[PDB]
């Protein structure tokens, strides 16, 4: 996020980091319950990647994070990678995450819910702060 | 470029698809929702993360970081996967697995 700010540690409990087998963070994700993570289909996740929950400082070794294995990758069949439409993938964890103060689920909207233009929302992540 | 060690956050406004089309044209589809062009921008590595909106103390996933400006320009709207257009599929997949 460019021009964002540091978050209060653990205040976005559903925010997970998708890391490859080398520990490199390549995408964000959101826990919707103890066994499922919602992310973007274009993140190209495979079962060799891992879901890390409870993390704040990726340069810190003192955080009690949960490195969770991915059992299955569900890429929405409607996903069109060339137009990047219906960009969503579900990740089923091999073992359930342990919910706590720093790890919990975000709510999903009803398909008919209306979110008006002008509404202020928030986005989080470990993406570049400067391009 | 610079990658942060610590989690970042930013508040930003939702745009209408019609208005967003003023920046992206036909690239904008019904299953997408734009936000930003407000002085902040999601950028490489934010992909897949949440775009949440608060109402009555609770946060709902309205978008998933998808794509946008090749240079993460803060005056261009970021494009997110519109969760309302994809939640039925989410519910179904979970119920079936």
């Amino acid at each position: 996020i460019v021009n964002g700010e540091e978050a209060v540690p653990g205040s976005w409990p559903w925010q997970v980091s998708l890391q490859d087998k080398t520990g490199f963070h390549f995408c964000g994700g959101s826990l919707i319950n103890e066994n499922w993570v919602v992310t973007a289909a274009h993140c190209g996740v495979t079962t060799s990647d891992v879901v890390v929950a409870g993390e704040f400082d990726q340069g810190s070794s003192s955080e009690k994070i949960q490195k969770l294995k991915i059992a299955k990758v569900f890429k929405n069949s409607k996903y069109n990678s060339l137009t990047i439409n219906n960009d969503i993938t579900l990740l089923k964890l091999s073992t359930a995450a342990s919910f706590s103060q720093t790890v919990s689920a975000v709510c999903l909207p009803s398909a008919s819910d209306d979110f008006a233009a002008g509404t202020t929302c928030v986005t989080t992540g470990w993406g570049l702060t400067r391009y | 470029a610079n990658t942060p060690d610590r989690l970042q956050q930013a508040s930003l406004p939702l745009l209408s698809n019609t208005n967003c089309k003023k920046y992206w044209g036909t690239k904008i589809k019904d299953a997408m929702i734009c936000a930003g062009a407000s002085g902040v921008s999601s950028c490489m590595g934010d992909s897949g993360g949440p775009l949440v909106c608060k109402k009555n103390g609770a946060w709902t996933l309205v978008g998933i970081v998808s794509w946008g400006s090749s240079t993460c320009s803060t005056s261009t709207p970021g494009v997110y996967a519109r969760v309302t257009a994809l939640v039925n599929w989410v519910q179904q997949t979970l119920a079936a697995n």
Partner: peptide, 10 residues
């Protein structure tokens, strides 16, 4: 869902 135990501060 959706209510962090540790309240975010913008």
């Amino acid at each position: 869902c959706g209510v962090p135990a540790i309240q975010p501060v913008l």
